[PDB]
Amino acid sequence: DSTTGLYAPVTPAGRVLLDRLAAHLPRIRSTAAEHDRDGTFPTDTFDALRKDGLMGATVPAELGGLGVDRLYDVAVALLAVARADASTALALHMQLSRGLTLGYEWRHGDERARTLAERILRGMVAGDAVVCSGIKDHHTAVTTLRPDGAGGWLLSGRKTLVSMAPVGTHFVINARTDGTDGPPRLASPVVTRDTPGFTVLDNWDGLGMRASGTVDIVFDDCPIPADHVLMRDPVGARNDAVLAGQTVSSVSVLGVYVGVAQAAYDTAVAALERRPEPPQAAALTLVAEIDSRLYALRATAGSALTAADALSADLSGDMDERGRQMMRHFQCAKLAVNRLAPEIVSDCLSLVGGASYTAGHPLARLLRDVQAGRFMQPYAYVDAVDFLSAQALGIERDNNYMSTWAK
Ligand SMILES: Cc1cn([C@H]2C[C@H](O)[C@@H](COP(=O)(O)OP(=O)(O)O[C@@H]3C[C@](C)(N)C(O)(O)[C@@H](C)O3)O2)c(=O)[nH]c1=O
């Protein structure tokens, strides 16, 4: 019955998601070290989740999905998976996040939007759609959509860091229009794996998250129909209202780092309890410091998730304010998660001692994986500080990171 600290799902659908996942932990857990050493994606893990209905966990119930719709419960499930393997959890988050955001498109967007959403969502439930996300351009390229002169579009460019890509059937891509007449827009084409000119590379070589499939994808004159395109707003047109969607789509990933911290602790404590001698002064002191820091990490992520779910559900008010507040809870918590979670994992290696310094020890992988959140937008630390200090001091700024990137 816990409602804090991400200790338990707060809804019956979240409870099912977590009980169902339990069945896959032994596989996820078992191929973790091999996939980390090789830098390869656990495709058999994802085949099993697909067949089990789990890749449709956040599709509305109305469409055949489990209907998990709390970010809190997604975070709880991701925390559980990340305790078994962080890379799998991170890949799964892209899919569960999409269930939530496509859900929103389905209930609230225009007819093109609702129709695309509904078709992808039903595919997610069926095990036919595995939806990847491509936001950041490779340095060599600016990803653009140009009119084909015939109703549809041609997508050229390259995205870097596209987790789950080796198994993705659908790729939601951040692109800017060009060669029309409007000021450039933000646009989200959806590319299917068999679109021509679309290539999935195999160049993911990570410090951590080595098994997350986080490769580049290339678009070369890719034909995209007009109705497979979610049009966004003009580049640099400031509406804080977009911040809500950008909170929905990443905030629950915080649970991955909370689970990595939890797994480091569980490992350290199991290591101490397996020892002949009674723990030393500094070992007892570390264990209490980590117990407390893990509690604060869980409560800070749990609390922002709770708040986000409440702000998310309320569409009655000022939508710009809703956006600002969502992003505020998310980024205040993220900054804390990105300091507490690596520090907890690092202190656990102090408890275990030099055994943790061999490539194969579980802590050695958790130390590497736990750093990943520091590099995920919105926002990495340097950008988080510009956003938070602007909010705190009421400084007007373009808070859309993709809008900025398009500049
Ligand atoms: C305004 C609003 C939008 N939305 C939704 C509908 C839009 O499709 C979406 C726009 O969000 P967003 O602009 O974040 O786009 P996205 O396609 O989700 O991309 C993200 C990028 C990220 C964070 N790196 C990720 O890879 O982890 C993945 C999973 O996706 O946000 C809401 O759910 N609630 C809202 O109140």
Closest CA to 45 of 87, 80, 78, 73: 87
Method by which the model was determined: X-ray
Task: With residue 33 as reference, give the H or E element that holds it.
Answer: helix 32-38
Check the annotation: does 357 bind a ligand: no
Q: Which of 383, 376, 393, 404 is nearest to 90 (CA)?
A: 376
Q: Which residue has the tokens 């990933």?
A: 253
Dist CA 195 CA 199 (whole Å): 9
Q: Is the link from the previous residue into 379 a cis peptide, with omega within 30 of 0?
A: yes
The answer to whether the CB of 135 is under 6 A from ligand 1 is: yes
Q: Which CATH number fits domain 131-241: 1.10.8.80, 2.40.110.10, 3.30.465.10, 1.10.10.60?
A: 2.40.110.10
87 has binding-site annotation: no
Residue partners of 281: CB distance under 8 A and separation at least 6: none
Write the DSSP assignment of 340-389 as a string of letters. HHHHHHHHHHHHH-GGGGSTTSHHHHHHHHTTGGGGSSS--HHHHHHHHH
Distance CA 281, CA 288 (A): 11
Tell me if 1-130 shares its fold with 242-407: no
Q: Which atom of ligand 1 is nearest to the CA of 109?
A: 6
DSSP secondary structure string for all residues of 119-156: HHHHHHHHT---EEEE-SBPTT---EEEE-SSSSEEEE
Q: Which residues contact 313 (CB under 8 A, 6 or more apart)?
A: none
191 close to ligand 1 (CB < 6 Angstrom): no
CA of 379 to the centre of ligand 1 (A): 14
What is the distance in A from the centroid of ligand 1 to the CA of 249?
A: 4
What single-letter amino acid sits at 319?
M
Task: Say whether domain 1-130 belongs to CATH 3.40.718.10.
Answer: no
Strands 144-147 and 175-177: parallel
Q: Which two tokens stand for residue 149?
A: 């002169």
Residue 278 is classified by DSSP as P
Distance CA 219, CA 223 (A): 9
For ligand 1, atom 1: residue with the closest CA: 245
Distance 101 CA to ligand 1 centre (A): 6
- Give the other-Cβ count within 10 Å of 407's Cβ: 9
- Of 214, 248, 375, the residue with max ligand 1 atoms within 8 A of its CB, to mutate for a pocket test, comes to 248
212 lines ligand 1 (CB under 6 A): no
CA 312, 318, 321, 323 torsion: positive or negative? positive
CATH number of this structure's domain 242-407, picked from the four choices 3.40.50.300, 3.40.50.1370, 3.30.540.10, 1.20.140.10: 1.20.140.10
Cβ 190 under 6 angstroms from ligand 1: no
Write out the H or E segment, with its range, that includes residue 88.
Answer: helix 86-108
Give the resolution value in Å.
Answer: 2.1
Q: Where in 137-213 does DSSP place strands (E)?
A: 144-147, 153-162, 170-173, 175-177, 185-192, 198-200
- Phi then psi dihedrals of residue 90, to 5 deg: -65, -50
Q: Where are the alpha helices (DSSP H) in 252-318?
A: 254-273, 281-313
- Going from the C-alpha of 123 to that of each of 54, 107, 129, 194, 215, the distances in angstroms are 12, 17, 5, 16, 23
For the chain, which residues make up each domain, given as ranges? Answer: 1-130, 131-241, 242-407
User: Contact 212/28 with Cβ under 8 angstroms?
Assistant: no
